[PDB]
Structure 1
Amino acid sequence: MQIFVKTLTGKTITLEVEPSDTIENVKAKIQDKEGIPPDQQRLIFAGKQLEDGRTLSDYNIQKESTLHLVL
């Protein structure tokens, strides 16, 4: 699976993954990429925030989509 993460600043970072549970775990994976710390980073897709610990699948998250994460 391929996913994209974007910021309002306009930079695009391309990331690779397949479904995992855990907002934290996704947060852990973004932690590794550019040496950017995730003490409280937010996930919106569908223009909505994703709460702690429920399945990614829920919401129909899917491949080649684009995401915008802000802390």
Structure 2
Amino acid sequence: MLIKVKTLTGKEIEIDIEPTDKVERIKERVEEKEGIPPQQQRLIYSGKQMNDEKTAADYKILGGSVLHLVLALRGG
């Protein structure tokens, strides 16, 4: 399951995580191709933000979509 999440400049994030995975580790790879550390990006799933494991099936199991992450600091 490829990821095409936009960013502050409409960039790309490669989560490469299936809908059965948790956003605690799914967002780790998404920001790995972006630059942010995993425990720093408050990823917003077009109306909600991940918390704890946050299994990707909860967010409608969307394929790629446009996840406009929040780049707030001091979240670790």
TM-score over 0.5 for the alignment?
yes
Q: Does 1:58 align with 2:45?
A: no
User: Distance between the aligned counterparts of 1:36 and 1:12, measured in 2?
Assistant: 13
| Structure 2 spans left out of the alignment, 5+ residues | 72-76
Show the counterpart of 2:12: 13
Gaps of 5+ in 1: none
Higher helix share: 2
Displacement of 1:57 in angstroms is 0.4
- Percent sequence identity over aligned pairs: 50
With CA pairs under 8 Å and 6+ residues apart, which has the higher RCO, 1 or 2? 1
Offset at residue 34 of structure 1 (A): 4.0
Distance 1:29 1:20, change over 3 A: farther
What letter corresponds to residue 4 of structure 1 in structure 2? Answer: K
Q: Which has the higher strand share?
A: 1
TM-score by length of 1: 0.68
- Two-structure CA RMSD over aligned residues (Å): 2.2
